[PDB]
Amino acid sequence: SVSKANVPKIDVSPLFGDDQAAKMRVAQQIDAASRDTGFFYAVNHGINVQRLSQKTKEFHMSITPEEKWDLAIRAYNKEHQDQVRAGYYLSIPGKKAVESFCYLNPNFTPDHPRIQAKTPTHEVNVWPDETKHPGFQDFAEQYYWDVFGLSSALLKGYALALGKEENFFARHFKPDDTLASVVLIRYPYLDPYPEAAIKTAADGTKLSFEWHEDVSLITVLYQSNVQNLQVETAAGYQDIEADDTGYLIDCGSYMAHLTNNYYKAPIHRVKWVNAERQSLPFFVNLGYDSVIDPFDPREPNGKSDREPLSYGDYLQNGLVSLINKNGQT
Ligand SMILES: CC(C)[C@@H](NC(=O)[C@H](CS)NC(=O)CCC[C@H](N)C(=O)O)C(=O)O
Ligand SMILES: [Fe+3]
């Protein structure tokens, strides 16, 4: 009935080092995975994912409805017109099980020129009361830069895998302007589970989130140990096995655009599973004005006539389109 995706485990630790041949061997594995199912697990990544999951669980399980309204994005609180991305994403008991908290670049302050300029997709993060959530903001901001660092190394692997110099992507991935986001998603156990929160796929599978390509350059995802993701292949959807020690990596549609679809953005979905679990993506977005010139690694001259795409416009459109297609999360 349902087969299992080949998701290789790639030791990415050489990407933090200066052994250039070893980096090329990592890049080959990234190339192979990106041309197959489009997913791999980054292992030996150096991030303390036990603390990540512990601190995230403490937050999800202690925040109150009052705090959720106070932090809610505009979709749940009309008072918060500036919160299109960052803030709390409320569940709706009986209708919607998932809930989450999204935050952006901590360097987006009122001082920041993009905030001053009111450029779309830039927002100042909102946070709960420190005394009610001691150490949470400090943990979350540290994690942002921890996973930023891992992502910068992965981008070197992707650049080398495509035959470019290692900073081809990472040079656009900067702490002062990155539009990257962290989302701390809670998927709850519920008995009874609300039928309204379960979607039925065309092929009959019960889903929590429908098929989509990622709005990102790449996505760097930690999940707890409950299998749920499926990737689409020509022979149908295949189960991605869980690994709560590694990061699940895949290309987003910005990468597919700039590589002339040589590295596709894999289509994937979330199966419905009645289990308490965590889904913690880091979406590797560039700066608002970042443009990468497309190329076609299939051609000798590498030439593409695809239009260079400004990352900010891509992100603003992608996030709205994803809400329209797959629902406000
Ligand atoms: C693990 C993923 C598939 C996760 N889904 C997701 O994160 C889905 C699909 S990639 N992503 C989104 O809704 C986009 C959130 C963007 C964020 N608010 C921002 O402003 O940057 C899940 O578990 O549902
Ligand atoms: Fe996704």
Ligand 2 centroid vs 303 CA: distance in angstroms? 29
Ligand 1: residue of 96, 98, 183 to mutate (most ligand atoms within 8 A of CB) is 183
Span from the CA of 248 to the centroid of ligand 1 (angstroms):
14
Long-range contacts of 297-306 (CB under 8 A, 24+ apart): 297/162, 297/163, 297/259, 297/260, 297/262, 298/260, 298/262, 304/260, 306/257, 306/258, 306/260
Number of the ligand closest to the Cα of 326: 1
Atom of ligand 1 nearest to the CA of 179: 21
Sign of the torsion formed by the C-alpha atoms of 22, 26, 28 and 29: positive
Task: Give the DSSP letter of residue 72.
Answer: B
* HSE-CB of 215 using CA atoms within 13 angstroms: 19
In this structure, whether the domain defined by 9-326 belongs to CATH 3.90.1150.30 is answered with: no
Query: What is the phi-psi region of residue 87: left when phi exceeds 0, alpha when psi lies from -120 to 50, beta otherwise?
Result: left
Instruction: Tell me: is residue 268 an annotated ligand-binding position.
Output: yes
Angle between helices 136-161 and 20-35 (to 10 degrees): 90
Q: Is 212 annotated as a binding residue?
A: yes
Q: How far apart are CA 304 and CA 286, in angstroms?
A: 21
Query: Of 312, 280, 42, nearest to 140 (Cα)?
Result: 280
The ligand 1 atom at the shortest distance from the C-alpha of residue 228 is: 23
Question: How many CB atoms neighbour CB 221 within 10 A?
Answer: 23
Report which ligand 1 atom has the smallest distance to the Cα of 214: 10
110 CA → ligand 2 middle, Å: 30
Whether 86 contacts 283, CB under 8 Å: no
Q: Resolution of this PDB entry, in A?
A: 1.6
∠ CA 225-228-229, rounded to 5°: 115
Output the ligand 1 site: residues, CB below 6 A. Answer: 85, 102, 181, 183, 185, 209, 212, 214, 221, 270, 279, 281, 283, 319, 322, 329
Alpha helices in the chain (DSSP H): 20-35, 49-62, 65-71, 113-116, 136-161, 253-258, 311-326
* Cα 102 to averaged position of ligand 1 atoms, centre (Å): 9
Which residues are registered as beta bridge partners of 280?
222
Whether 305 has a binding-site annotation, put simply, is: no
Backbone φ and ψ for 170, nearest 5 degrees, come out as -65, -25
Q: What are the φ/ψ torsions at residue 164 (nearest 5 degrees)?
A: -100, 170
Burial class (CB within 10 angstroms; exposed 0-12, middle 13-18, buried 19+) of 251: buried
Contacts of 1 (CB under 8 A, 6+ apart): none
Q: Tokens at residue 210, please?
A: 């429908």
Method: X-ray
CA separation, residue 312 to residues 141, 279, 290, 315 (Å): 22, 25, 7, 5
Amino acid letter, 120: P
Q: What is the maximum alpha-carbon separation in the chain?
A: 60
Residues 6+ apart with CB under 8 A from 104: 85, 86, 122, 123, 125, 179, 180, 181
